[PDB]
Write an enzyme that holds these catalytic residues in place. Structure first.
Site, PDB file in Angstrom:
ATOM      1  N   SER A   1      27.571  42.233  33.098  1.00 55.10           N
ATOM      2  CA  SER A   1      27.462  42.677  34.474  1.00 55.10           C
ATOM      3  C   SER A   1      28.214  41.716  35.425  1.00 55.10           C
ATOM      4  O   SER A   1      28.075  40.500  35.312  1.00 55.10           O
ATOM      5  CB  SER A   1      25.994  42.827  34.855  1.00 55.10           C
ATOM      6  OG  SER A   1      25.908  43.253  36.205  1.00 55.10           O
ATOM      7  N   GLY A   2      29.022  42.285  36.317  1.00 56.90           N
ATOM      8  CA  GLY A   2      29.835  41.521  37.247  1.00 56.90           C
ATOM      9  C   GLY A   2      31.187  41.083  36.698  1.00 56.90           C
ATOM     10  O   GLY A   2      31.954  40.471  37.436  1.00 56.90           O
TER      11      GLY A   2
ATOM     12  N   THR B   1      34.151  48.011  36.092  1.00 56.08           N
ATOM     13  CA  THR B   1      34.281  49.151  36.956  1.00 56.08           C
ATOM     14  C   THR B   1      35.559  49.055  37.802  1.00 56.08           C
ATOM     15  O   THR B   1      36.279  50.049  37.976  1.00 56.08           O
ATOM     16  CB  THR B   1      33.018  49.276  37.795  1.00 56.08           C
ATOM     17  OG1 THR B   1      31.918  49.697  36.951  1.00 56.08           O
ATOM     18  CG2 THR B   1      33.171  50.372  38.811  1.00 56.08           C
TER      19      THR B   1
ATOM     20  N   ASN C   1      25.671  41.298  40.564  1.00 54.14           N
ATOM     21  CA  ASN C   1      26.754  42.086  41.086  1.00 54.14           C
ATOM     22  C   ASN C   1      26.268  42.871  42.294  1.00 54.14           C
ATOM     23  O   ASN C   1      25.269  43.595  42.211  1.00 54.14           O
ATOM     24  CB  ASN C   1      27.198  43.057  39.963  1.00 54.14           C
ATOM     25  CG  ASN C   1      28.443  43.838  40.323  1.00 54.14           C
ATOM     26  OD1 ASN C   1      28.915  43.779  41.465  1.00 54.14           O
ATOM     27  ND2 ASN C   1      28.983  44.609  39.347  1.00 54.14           N
TER      28      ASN C   1
ATOM     29  N   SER D   1      26.625  46.714  41.179  1.00 54.49           N
ATOM     30  CA  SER D   1      26.373  46.908  39.753  1.00 54.49           C
ATOM     31  C   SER D   1      26.241  48.378  39.381  1.00 54.49           C
ATOM     32  O   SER D   1      25.559  49.142  40.054  1.00 54.49           O
ATOM     33  CB  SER D   1      25.093  46.189  39.311  1.00 54.49           C
ATOM     34  OG  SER D   1      24.874  46.334  37.913  1.00 54.49           O
ATOM     35  N   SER D   2      26.877  48.748  38.286  1.00 54.14           N
ATOM     36  CA  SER D   2      26.736  50.088  37.744  1.00 54.14           C
ATOM     37  C   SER D   2      25.402  50.123  37.004  1.00 54.14           C
ATOM     38  O   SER D   2      25.205  49.353  36.082  1.00 54.14           O
ATOM     39  CB  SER D   2      27.858  50.389  36.766  1.00 54.14           C
ATOM     40  OG  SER D   2      29.133  50.243  37.369  1.00 54.14           O
TER      41      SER D   2
ATOM     42  N   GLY E   1      28.488  45.481  27.789  1.00 51.48           N
ATOM     43  CA  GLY E   1      28.589  44.923  26.451  1.00 51.48           C
ATOM     44  C   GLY E   1      27.195  44.560  25.944  1.00 51.48           C
ATOM     45  O   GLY E   1      26.203  44.990  26.530  1.00 51.48           O
TER      46      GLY E   1
ATOM     47  N   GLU F   1      23.676  43.092  25.498  1.00 51.76           N
ATOM     48  CA  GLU F   1      22.820  42.478  26.512  1.00 51.76           C
ATOM     49  C   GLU F   1      21.764  41.625  25.836  1.00 51.76           C
ATOM     50  O   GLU F   1      21.022  42.117  24.985  1.00 51.76           O
ATOM     51  CB  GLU F   1      22.123  43.525  27.391  1.00 51.76           C
ATOM     52  CG  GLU F   1      23.046  44.278  28.346  1.00 51.76           C
ATOM     53  CD  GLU F   1      22.298  45.304  29.186  1.00 51.76           C
ATOM     54  OE1 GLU F   1      21.156  45.661  28.827  1.00 51.76           O
ATOM     55  OE2 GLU F   1      22.848  45.772  30.201  1.00 51.76           O
TER      56      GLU F   1
END
Ligand code: ADP
Ligand code: BEF
Ligand code: MG
Length: 719
Positions: free
Chosen positions: A171-172, A176, A217, A220-221, A441, A443
């Protein structure tokens, strides 16, 4: 021609600038911190060790097959790490860092495009930048998301084969943003355009409802996606389709400190007009329980009112009617109202609702009967034995049921938004496609629950797909030139973990979870006990903890992950009281009604558990990927502070170990990594001409082929 004009922005922002003896190694000054290296000069050697001088001018020794040799300085900033003589951890990191110091965030590593988040704007995504990459081979231009995009596009056109780009990382890390660049690039090189614009505008819509500020993020998605960009046989964009995965529905009802709920809630309350505000019974975020618990209602640098305009604009472009847009906002407002319903204890154990304000407001916006809703919430009828009896729920159960209704509404709405978008974008007979996967990816958090197991399960399959892709490529190349290496498909190594998760016989975790779910008398405790009974000291990829009674470990490709079992049964069933379903099926709103009456949205199909649906969707995704030529992008976060110019060794090296680049870049080094065409090596009989340049100087370091000469690791480097 910017590629040849050293004064161009291309040269300035994408290339190492061009103008007109001894050995070194990377060592740890403190042996406890394996990722903090300094450069030490080798001064002498025995046969099994080196002696080097540290920065503090000292003398140490280390074994030869333990030494992290530093590549010759000339290689510092190389565009493809496949060129490095040494591929040890510090060496790989060093090259990434030298490039990053120059704001060169893209670097190849064999098949991978490595992208390191700059956390600042870099002007390499303009139309002029786009035009430069058109038609250029990977080795003709600098590393860039646009170059992999172009290579894929040309492969599609030249090979008449579908393509995929898999963009992963934590994340971050930048997944995206890079996904959006791929779409921008394809839109430009293959576009006209109304369609192109509708495709681009799908994004803002999904991000308003699917993204949120987390601690990692600001954008974040909270869902995964696979975007299929479709093309006709002439190579022009003809459509698109989006598949979404694992939406974090729980965020709607709870957010950690400093985090936010989904963007849309803040966009609506800040961007609604006076009319809408009173008409939806809206107020400020501080007046809604679902928005006033984290302590954060705004993001530095973001105007929710402006974004709301962007969101509405995207909705117009895609073709959402004004009525549909209004209903969408009614659903968002109703959810906030549901969140404000305060259940209190009655005379008995049964909850009561003293003030009807939020209930009525929710009921008004959703267009449902408040009396029917109140009962559905507090006195649902359950099939006990043969009797259908209304049960009076306490405060806890009433609150939880309400939260379930909210999550079901948000989840179903998101699915509806996706299908609506697909109805406009999808072909319907496409000739070819380029698919872009934007998902997390592996986690490994301090607490890992069912959602983590699902994503880690996906990543096991993606990593296996990568390893198998490498095996096939190498096997084909070797068997082409006839050249005896027996190599093992490393993809086989992933099967045991995959089986532990998804196997049918013997049953894996998901199967046992399903068995415990669809039959009575099960708890978190019976579930964890069953898992231990099947796998503890019996499956090599599983570990029963020494003390915890609620956790279990799985040995994943990227390391052991410990999972906690709380609420897995509920998560797998994802229940909603039938009376609530009945309540909303009678809704007067046109969108709400689809969310509960269209089985493609209201139901998982024939039930099936959440785990089973996840397994099926992943298998469908893998089957689609298997028909494509894949391309791999690994996004890397430089630190955990969202700061530029701060490439942290420990943070980066961990990602390199767990994402497959460190492991992957080495696999080719087994055997003969460098292969060159005879004629290009000499620069009559090319073969003999080469046998002679080589003989002019160990034959074991090479194995001639049918068209190329094969060298062992480092050999080509020596020449
Ligand atoms: N190439 C980039 N250039 C500028 N900013 C970037 C870039 N890639 C990542 N970002 C910054 O990092 C943030 C997070 O990136 P994002 O793509 O949302 O991560 P992920 O999708 O991997 O969770 C962005 O919102 C932006 O501020
Ligand atoms: F937060 Be990112 F979308 F993984
Ligand atoms: Mg994202």
């Amino acid at each position: 021609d910017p590629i040849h004009d050293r004064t161009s922005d291309y040269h300035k922002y994408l290339k190492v600038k061009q103008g007109d003896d001894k050995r070194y190694i990377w060592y740890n000054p403190d042996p406890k911190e394996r990722d903090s290296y300094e450069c030490g000069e080798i001064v002498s050697e025995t046969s099994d060790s080196f002696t080097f001088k540290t920065v503090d001018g000292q003398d140490r020794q280390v074994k030869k097959d333990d030494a992290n040799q530093r590549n010759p300085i000339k290689f510092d900033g190389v565009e493809d790490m496949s060129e490095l003589s040494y591929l040890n951890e510090p060496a790989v990191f060093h090259n990434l860092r030298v490039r990053y110091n120059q704001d060169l965030i893209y670097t190849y590593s064999g098949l991978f495009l490595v992208a390191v988040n700059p956390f600042k704007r870099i002007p390499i995504y303009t139309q002029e930048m786009v035009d430069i990459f058109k038609g250029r081979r990977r080795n003709e231009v600098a590393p860039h998301i646009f170059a992999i995009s172009d290579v894929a596009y040309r492969s599609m056109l030249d090979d008449r084969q579908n393509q995929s780009l898999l963009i992963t990382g934590e994340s971050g890390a930048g997944k995206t943003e890079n996904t959006k660049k791929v779409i921008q690039y394809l839109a430009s090189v293959a576009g006209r355009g109304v369609l192109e614009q509708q495709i681009l505008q799908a994004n803002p819509i999904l991000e308003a409802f699917g993204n949120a500020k987390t601690t990692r993020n600001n954008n974040s998605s909270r869902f995964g996606k696979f975007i299929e960009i479709q093309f006709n046989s002439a190579g022009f964009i003809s459509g698109a389709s989006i598949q979404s995965y694992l939406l974090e529905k729980s965020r709607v009802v709870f957010q950690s400190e400093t985090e936010r709920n989904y963007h849309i809630f803040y966009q609506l309350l800040a961007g609604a007009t006076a009319e809408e505000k009173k008409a939806l019974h809206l107020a400020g975020p501080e007046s809604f329980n679902y928005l006033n618990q984290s302590g954060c209602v705004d993001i530095k640098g973001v105007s929710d009112s402006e974004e709301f305009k962007i969101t509405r604009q995207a909705m117009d472009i895609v073709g959402f009617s004004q009525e549909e847009q209004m209903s969408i906002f009614k659903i968002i407002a109703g959810i906030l109202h549901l969140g404000n319903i305060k259940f209190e204890k009655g005379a008995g154990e049964g909850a009561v609702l003293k003030d009807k304000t939020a209930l009525n407001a929710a009921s008004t916006v959703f267009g449902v009967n408040p009396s029917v809703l109140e009962k559905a919430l507090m006195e649902p009828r359950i099939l006990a034995g043969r009797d259908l009896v209304a049960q009076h729920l306490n405060v806890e159960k009433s609150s939880s049921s309400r939260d379930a209704l909210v999550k079901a509404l948000y989840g179903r709405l998101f699915l509806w938004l996706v299908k609506k978008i697909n109805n406009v974008l999808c072909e319907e007979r496409k000739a070819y496609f380029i698919g872009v996967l934007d998902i997390e990816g592996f986690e490994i958090f301090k607490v890992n629950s069912f959602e983590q197991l699902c994503i880690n399960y996906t990543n096991e399959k993606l990593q296996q797909f990568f390893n198998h892709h490498m095996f096939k490529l190498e096997q084909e190349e070797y068997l082409k030139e006839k050249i005896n290496w027996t190599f093992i498909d490393f993809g086989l190594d992933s099967q045991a973990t995959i089986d532990l998760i998804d196997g049918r016989q013997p049953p894996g975790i998901l199967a046992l979870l399903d068995e415990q779910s669809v039959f009575p008398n099960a708890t978190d405790n019976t579930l964890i006990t069953k898992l231990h009974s099947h796998f503890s000291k019996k499956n090599a990829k599983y570990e029963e903890p020494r003390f915890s009674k609620t956790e279990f470990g799985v040995t994943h490709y990227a390391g052991q992950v410990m999972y906690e079992i709380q609420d897995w049964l509920e998560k797998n069933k994802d229940p909603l009281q039938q009376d609530l379903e009945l309540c909303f099926k009678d809704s007067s709103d046109n969108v709400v009604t689809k969310l509960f009456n269209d089985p493609n949205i209201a139901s998982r199909a024939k039930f099936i558990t959440v785990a089973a649906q996840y397994k099926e969707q992943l298998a469908s995704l893998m089957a689609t990927l298997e028909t494509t030529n894949p391309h791999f992008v690994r996004c890397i976060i430089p630190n955990n502070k969202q700061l530029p110019a701060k490439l942290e060794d420990k943070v980066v090296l961990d990602q390199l170990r767990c994402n497959g680049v460190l492991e992957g870049i080495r696999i080719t080094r087994k055997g003969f990594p460098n292969r060159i065409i005879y004629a290009d090596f000499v620069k009559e009989d090319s073969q003999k001409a080469t046998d002679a340049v080589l003989k002019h100087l160990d034959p074991e370091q090479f194995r001639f082929g049918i068209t190329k000469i094969f060298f062992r690791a480092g050999q080509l480097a020596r020449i």
